[PDB]
Amino acid sequence: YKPQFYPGETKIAQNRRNHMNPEVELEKLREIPDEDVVKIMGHRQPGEDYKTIHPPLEEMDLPDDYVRDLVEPINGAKEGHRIRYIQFADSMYFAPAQPYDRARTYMWRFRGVDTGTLSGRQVIEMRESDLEALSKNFLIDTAFFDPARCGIRGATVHGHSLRLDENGLMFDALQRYVYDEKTGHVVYVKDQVGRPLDEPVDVGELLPEEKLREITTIYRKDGVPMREDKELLTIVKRIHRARTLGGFCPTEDTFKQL
Amino acid sequence: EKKLFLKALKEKFEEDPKEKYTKFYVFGGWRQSARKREFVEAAEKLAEKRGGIPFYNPDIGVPLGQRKLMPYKLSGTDYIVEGDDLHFMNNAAMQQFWDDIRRTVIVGMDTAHAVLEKRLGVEVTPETINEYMETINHALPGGAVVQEHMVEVHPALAWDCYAKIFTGDDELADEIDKKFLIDINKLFPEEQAEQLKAAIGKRTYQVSRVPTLVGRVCDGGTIARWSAMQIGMSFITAYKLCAGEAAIADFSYAAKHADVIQMGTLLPARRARGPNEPGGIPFGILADVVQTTRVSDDPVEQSLEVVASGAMLYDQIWLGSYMSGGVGFTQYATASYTDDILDDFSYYGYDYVEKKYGICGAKPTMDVVEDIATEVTLYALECYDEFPALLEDHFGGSQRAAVAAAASGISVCMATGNSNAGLNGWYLSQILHKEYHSRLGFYGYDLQDQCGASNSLSIRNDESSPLELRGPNYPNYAMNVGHQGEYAGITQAAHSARKDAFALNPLIKVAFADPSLVFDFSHPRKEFARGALREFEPAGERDPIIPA
Amino acid sequence: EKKLFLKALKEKFEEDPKEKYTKFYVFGGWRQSARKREFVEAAEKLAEKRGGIPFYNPDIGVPLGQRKLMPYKLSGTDYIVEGDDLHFMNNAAMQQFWDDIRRTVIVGMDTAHAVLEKRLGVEVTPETINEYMETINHALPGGAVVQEHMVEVHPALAWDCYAKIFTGDDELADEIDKKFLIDINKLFPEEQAEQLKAAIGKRTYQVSRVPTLVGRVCDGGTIARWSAMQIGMSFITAYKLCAGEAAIADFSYAAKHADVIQMGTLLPARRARGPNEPGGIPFGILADVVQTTRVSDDPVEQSLEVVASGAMLYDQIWLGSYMSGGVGFTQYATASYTDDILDDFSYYGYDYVEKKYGICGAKPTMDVVEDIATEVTLYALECYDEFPALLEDHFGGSQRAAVAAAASGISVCMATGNSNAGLNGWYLSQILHKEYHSRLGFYGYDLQDQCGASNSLSIRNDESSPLELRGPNYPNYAMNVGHQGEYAGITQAAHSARKDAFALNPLIKVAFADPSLVFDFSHPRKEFARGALREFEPAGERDPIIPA
Amino acid sequence: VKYEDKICLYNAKGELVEENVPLEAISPLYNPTIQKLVKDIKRTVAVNLAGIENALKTGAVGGKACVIPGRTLDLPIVENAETIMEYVDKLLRISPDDDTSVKLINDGKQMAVQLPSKRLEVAAEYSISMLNTAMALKEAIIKTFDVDMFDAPMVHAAILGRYPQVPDYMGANIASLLGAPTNLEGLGYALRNIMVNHYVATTKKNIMNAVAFASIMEQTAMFEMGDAIGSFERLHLLGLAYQGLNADNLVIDLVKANGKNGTVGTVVASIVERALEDGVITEDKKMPSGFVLYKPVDVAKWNAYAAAGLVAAVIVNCGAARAAQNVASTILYYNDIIEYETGLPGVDFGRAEGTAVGFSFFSHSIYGGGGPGIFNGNHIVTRHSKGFAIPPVCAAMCVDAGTQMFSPEKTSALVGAVFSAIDEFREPLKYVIDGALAVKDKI
Amino acid sequence: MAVQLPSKRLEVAAEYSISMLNTAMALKEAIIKTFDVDMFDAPMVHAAILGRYPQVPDYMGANIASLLGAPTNLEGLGYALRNIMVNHYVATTKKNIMNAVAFASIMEQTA
Ligand code: F43
């Protein structure tokens, strides 16, 4: 069986499908060394020991479970590393990744993930060791991120649905990241919670709207309207009707009314 | 000209609504708000009273005012107020809206009159009814009628306390003093008045308004008891019955269980509450509390007037305080009745429907529901794409999800006249909105929306119900904002499409038409504005018993 | 000199208290009362506002004032007020007594501090606790701490809203700012302070006082939620945790179920009500709300101060309004705290006991209970025989039955120190009183008294309970006046005999010792007099948002 | 029989037990061990003699932080647990041959009381077990130690807490798997008032047995609610068979195929391929993009296939991270993905997705809820899905390596200690299949 | 109409309300199928049988009744068999004294 991932006849529905397909290597746009990434997360520091909550799985006499042992745990679970977060606020103005989009990509490509979708924010809870590994290679270094349209936030996430600033950055009431007039790049002066970092970390150049339109997963009247994607509307209408008829009468005859 | 909300947006922001870019961090924080300035000047002035104890300080936590602290224009009015003025705690009109419902209880009179004429052998005559009505207007506010050495409630605290009558029997109506009567023939258009009387029958009902102060000191469960307690005494006095006889017990049971109509019913142990609380009020009952049906000929205005009242009661007072508390859910509700945004979308849907199906021109089918609901939704979200300031206004996705779905639901009801059809329409809007912007509401907003499509037309015991009889205690609906108030609006839409005088209860509709009520239930949105401008005088204040 | 009540009787009536005969029908009706005169002058003045609708008129029904409309001297005070001034509706102090309880909720802090230091890895330090305490004093009254574009509650409406701390750990106490701390060592005598700390342990508790206005607009169930809602936000802010993480859910469950202490619990469906309502408050909990234990060394004064508070809350507010309404049960309660009548009987019983058994000198046995209970009862009823004016004062037999039995019960507790022994004593008094005057209370007064003797020392599931844990929802006690308030007094008597710092809950005892409370819980009787003289300033008024 | 459906029975170790068994052999209406589970749940009460003893000794009764000074009783209750069990048994036993069971747990510190089933036959509801045990304990303690008549009220407070003032068992030292009828969300929800941790403690953290127990009670509760009547009976019977009872080895086969390198998405692709292979779903229409929109051949069976995959999805996701917090997100996006992958309705037609939406919220917000383990089918947040959401939650608490505050240990200490000893309660999958084999030919 | 559930349904049930709920559903399914009631009209059938449930936790406006009132309305635990109106005992007995006393005493003492 070859999975379909997502319905739709537009570029937006294809971008959502490419984000979900684990065989689609997302275009690398920047290189953000690991030492700098952990700092913006603001949990621990580089060249340091991973704080633990529970001892490694090998050091535990857990009761027998034939089904449990089939599921191969991730390295973070194996050595009992703590589970921390990383959140993103995505601008509705052609941000490369979108809230529900992020969630279905994470559930398709990564193992043992706790994702949470909200309008103004998207939270991912994972084993610190494996979290930092995908947070750099996949979440920041690829086309899945943009320093201006994707705000790394912990609290006061307001700005996603807000008009952009003078220089193309999203609203941030806590000034975590500023636009540099000199380099033309976005530099995070604070972490996701809002604590000032002694050494500011640069994320890179802002992408123009012209290319964000070709990679974005959001339908807009400015870009690709959802009215255009006649196929996506068909499946949504179906999911709706199948649910309606399923709640009324769960028979094969009832479902002839689809 | 063009969209209805543009006027309001141009007043809120001095920039082009279509402008994608703006200036931030230049507003000097909370100082930009004349309201936040007042709050600081108040907290500073009150430091002495609290002694050393620190109080309200905007410097604690997040610095409010980094963006533009936008004001709110009430839909259908030229009144622009600060957001803080629309918080139930800060608004005396919103407090009286609820207080006027809580203190209401309708009691049947035929049962008592039958006991009087059958087992008691006392004739009932219009002149006697008029005497009873004068006795209850002395007794209900806390006045003594039977016992010696009785202490009484101060009339200056209970000036808003009264008991009135109404009847479907037109012959008995002409024979009752106009001061005690809620006249169906004078308050309602004769098309509506005939529909109410037809549904009510020749039966006679008493509306008892317990004083505001009672529900403020006590609760909603007190109301039916206070009313029954004084109804019985007034019956003893007016008809000169024995002060404690066997027949009296028939009146107490009738006035408290058999022929009594409460606004809200009790709630289960988890969210334990007595009757006449916002959680027990069904959507149809709340639609019937709103009086715009007998004032406006506009079916959209009628529906959106119930949305306003519903959003305020259910999300600001009920879910915002009773079920949560603190800063609350003011802007979760304001979105549905400010800046004419839901107004524009609903009028679009009405026009769409009027020209394709005609108002009440399509019997409910899945093809109709799916056509309207998709059309209105796509239009709503497109307005948010066209105007960045409209998106900045409805910043929270939940506000957008509620508004876009309410317009979709009301529009489905405009064609079908079926509350469940409009309910089904709402749930398609929600799942369409999710796939459009790849987001919906807050973390746990669409619990009831994902369950929605299946339970909307279900027949199972805890899943089925016509929207009119659903409410804040319906399993899926019992937790989340941006739903309940709009469901009350979808309920009204089904009946505004039909030109129905009432949605669920004609007694409640008649009861809330009385000019003796403090809150003007015919114009809720303008009344909220009056309270926001500190121009509303509520009842329940304790001036006659406190130092000046 | 002689009986304590004689002074009060001589002031109420200008005749000899022992005089069997008097003059009637010469007082000119309701006109004899300066209070009934005010009520008429008010009702006349308010005719315009109500339009045509008739209002309060003393000429309807019974003509009050055919006998002498007697005033009431508050027990232990020289304040003589009109009866009407002691009605909860007309008294702002009585309203604040209840309001101050309703808006109270105690929350544990150790559980949260453990979650902070274990799963979150955030160290808890006195300086951080002090920061949290300042954040909660901004958040609790309706102040924003985390989100942008938040509207807020007007500080002038919530000046009475604050959150404080208290701890048994003396080391942590010296390290917390005095403004945020309820100091056990400074508010209580060191004999009591050591007993409280011993019972509480080294644990730390937060007392959150939700604004008065909240419980007035909403209900008692709102209180714990409002507190929990703002506790969580203050914890997010002060410790800079994620705004919506997995660990947050541990705080919400702890603050709403696990480590939360409410004043009252929920009630069954028939009398459906949420927590923090008068029906859910156990007698011992109410005894612990009263603060006379840390102010007076008199065990009789302490017991009779709880009787006053209990009679007022349970029979005037609870049974008088919540469960009934109208004119209410003012004089059913006043009898237990006016004219020093219950005071005289209780002091007699104390003296009887002190000299025969000694205070806390007899282990409870049927011979002790039967000896004391018969002695005090016979004495009480004899005073009613000696003084016709004392009988004219306590005209209702229920008032007499309550007073005579309360004195009997308190006196049994003075010898035994067992609440059930005093409870058993009360029920013998009742059946003795019935055989003495061949009458007792009203038609259905002794339901709980005839069931009383058997259920007082019962072990069956719906019959057993130590009086401290019984209350308005105990099956037999759930309906009738002149019982509940006095049971709260019998509960205190068992502990005042022992010199106990508290009766049931030491947290509640500590919580209500705070000088930041509007009502003075150390002198309830004098406070009721202050309200009756319109000298009490309550919270919850809406002056900052209403026209002047 | 009523239905032609045949199901192949598989155990907790993915081994075939029997093939072509009638679907109705696993029905609560026919299975004798499901009948035993319900009967025993309704009649079994956990007793904390150590708790009762400490409460009296100190005067700490009727709720938390409550202490009555001057009413303390020092009694060697735990020491004489053997005499108390003999007295309690004697007070509850109808005949020497009845099912009455009074046993000591943790060296008489705790106690397990089972009322004779006849008492419940003449009883209108389940609370009889708590009430008759409460009384039997009082009578036993008071008589044994000759407790004074004036001290006797404290014994009631030590056992039943603050009852009758509080309509619930506040501060009670006796517990039942079933919460009081006053606290029911809806009518018939009685069997749903079982905490997730209780299912996890009873099973001894075994996944298949936790899923089976939760599914059994949840689906049996659907029959009480009238949710499994007519057209819906088959929907719930197949749901119980595939989701909770590992029919056709579906649950295990999906875990085996996605255990090593599988994600929620791969589990979705696996169940779709499996469903399409067995002909439970066929292609309806091919969309412009080439996306194949599928239709169910068998509505009730597709839902059951999806429900079984949902349990597999939590075993694979929550088991990869060894944390139970992922469950709310796993239940949400398994259904969200399955719908936009095929165009078919998700588990319980969006109800299981919706339940998970609120579950994610309350297990991560300030308004209420808590850790995944405190929830139940009778909770306002997790009651919306009709027996399809609670079983996958149990599979998650089982694999969690103690990353919860309200973990099985803190909430199901007393409750778990009793039922883990009962054979059918700890291993329900093993005995419902034995119960199905015993009736398979009599239907 | 008189409906008696098979006793086995109650054996696998935790409490008595199953009888009201299973009858309510059986009536709905019967009426809707027999007369081919439209899917959009079907919610009115539920309201005609169960009243205002689930908004109201009790059977408000229900056209189906049981001698036993809902568990939500119990005064105390175990009171279920006591929730029978005096008139119900009197109507069932056909106003026979000894049989009325017996029935009431039987349920009361069994309770
Ligand atoms: C701390 C929480 C977690 C929680 O359980 N509730 C919060 C906060 C809570 C607090 C805010 C208290 C304060 O500011 O001091 C109150 C007012 C409720 C209360 N406890 O009194 C509230 N939110 Ni919130 N909350 C809101 C909303 C929102 C929107 C905001 C999105 C944006 O971009 O601005 C998001 C949810 C989402 O992304 O979908 C949201 C989440 C959050 N909301 C995140 C904070 C996220 C952040 O760091 O910015 N709220 C809304 O969606 C609009 C209405 C608004 C509510 C206030 C009102 O109605 O006036 C308020 C409703």
Ligand SMILES: C[C@@H](OP(=O)(O)O)[C@H](NC(=O)CCCCCCS)C(=O)O
């Ligand atoms: C879930 C439940 O909370 P608990 O889990 O019982 O603490 C429930 N609260 C609510 O639904 C609060 C609703 C108001 C705040 C959320 C608005 S989205 C209640 O108190 O019954």
Ligand SMILES: O=S(=O)(O)CCS
């Ligand atoms: O952030 S949350 O969705 O948890 C609450 C929004 S009010």
Ligand SMILES: O=S(=O)(O)CCS
């Ligand atoms: O007369 S009654 O005993 O019925 C009521 C007294 S308040």
Ligand SMILES: [Br-]
């Ligand atoms: Br484009």
Ligand SMILES: [K+]
């Ligand atoms: K109130």
